[PDB]
Design a binder for this molecule. Sequence first.
Ligand SMILES: CC(=O)N[C@H]1[C@H](O[C@@H]2[C@H](O)[C@@H](O)[C@H](O[C@H]3[C@H](O)[C@@H](O)[C@H](O)O[C@@H]3CO)O[C@@H]2CO)O[C@H](CO)[C@H](O)[C@@H]1O[C@@H]1O[C@H](CO)[C@H](O)[C@H](O[C@]2(C(=O)O)C[C@H](O)[C@@H](NC(C)=O)[C@H]([C@H](O)[C@H](O)CO)O2)[C@H]1O
Length: 420
Amino acid sequence: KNITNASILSIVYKDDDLIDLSRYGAEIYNGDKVYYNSIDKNQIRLINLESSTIEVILKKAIVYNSMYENFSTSFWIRIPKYFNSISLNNEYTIINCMENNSGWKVSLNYGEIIWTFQDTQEIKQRVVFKYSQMINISDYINRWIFVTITNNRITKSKIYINGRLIDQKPISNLGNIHASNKIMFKLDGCRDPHRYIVIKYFNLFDKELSEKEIKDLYDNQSNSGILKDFWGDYLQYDKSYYMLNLYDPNKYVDVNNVGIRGYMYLKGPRDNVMTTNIYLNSSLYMGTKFIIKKYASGNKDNIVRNNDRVYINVVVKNKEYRLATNASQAGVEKILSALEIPDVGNLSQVVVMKSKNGITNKCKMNLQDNNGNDIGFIGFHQFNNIAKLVASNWYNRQIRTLGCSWEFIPVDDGWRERPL
Ligand SMILES: CC(=O)N[C@H]1[C@H](O[C@@H]2[C@H](O)[C@@H](O)[C@H](O[C@H]3[C@H](O)[C@@H](O)[C@H](O)O[C@@H]3CO)O[C@@H]2CO)O[C@H](CO)[C@H](O)[C@@H]1O[C@@H]1O[C@H](CO)[C@H](O)[C@H](O[C@]2(C(=O)O)C[C@H](O)[C@@H](NC(C)=O)[C@H]([C@H](O)[C@H](O)CO)O2)[C@H]1O
């Protein structure tokens, strides 16, 4: 509540332009090469060209010398995977608030997010969040990250990642820090010509936010009633997704045969994608693609929301089939099939999409019969040496990471894969 009262700058897209949602009406000038996402116009893409800039000029009325002695900043960022060795040891600024090399800045490097304070004598202080690109599945590479930095010139600068304290360093051993009236959003000194960032909801606060305020800010801007894909964008209808099971990520979905005599199952291992000394990850663009189809969502847009009731279509050899099961089979594990859409009949197929209950959970798909009864969340079961996909009320009772925990993965420009 008093988090909006501490705002001195709050950038959002509104009615065909970026505007300040604080009461101080900062001037905001865009370059010719700034882009906005058509599904979420608050997502701002800046590329590595001189004309891809956002310059903010704060009104002189709100600029005073000690305005950055006690203040915080928050924003979301999505950083595409580094793939070129020119990016190693190439620190580059993305948010600059400095005059004569004094002030504060946010910068990036290979697997790093960096906050830097710098007085007029060139005494720097940095706090850093580090993530590796040598990792099977990363929570950070090309996925939306919530960043918060808090500053108290008596004590410490602190960087938080997804509401969690990462690094903290004292900033009391610092001289005079200039207070610029300008914040420059721009990739400054990046040698990767194809580098870009995506940001949203940049905020400036006139106080050092607590852990509690940071957590609550992370949760509100997380939109917990909307389902997310793997990258943290809104999950969507009529969109193709590769499936990743969070209990067994070194697997991908395959279909034995279409029809009621067949089944879907987790097959492994995944291939690796690599560039020597830059990254080594599991391939994400593998296996049978899922498509979510509207059944009873009345909302006109294509966004999947908590409790939406849907059909799941399954792509096999460029043809769509219907995920379904005969719930009358014996046992609580109901093996799933991929049926010709005309042949579904009265078999169970209606799926309740879940993001939370208000406890958020990664188990996304609760299959129902045609009388409103739970058949179970969609996961898998080890039958001998084959892990077949099932719906099972066992999951519903347990509801940690379970076999029903899934991520939906679309092809994204920030994660490029090329086989052979
Ligand atoms: C361990 C097991 O068999 N779990 C069954 C569950 O077992 C019931 C009791 O809880 C068991 O103690 C008891 O044991 C008997 C055996 O059934 C019997 O054949 C044997 O001869 O004697 C034992 C008695 O000493 O059995 C009863 C049932 O008879 O029964 C339920 C039925 O509701 C489940 O089938 C269950 O297996 C679990 O099934 C769900 C789907 O319904 C799911 O597949 C669970 O699997 C995962 C998961 O998706 O989370 C995935 C992994 O394959 C699985 N195992 C391993 C080794 O990694 C893990 C873990 O089991 C754990 O749940 C972590 O998530 O979970 C699957 O376990």
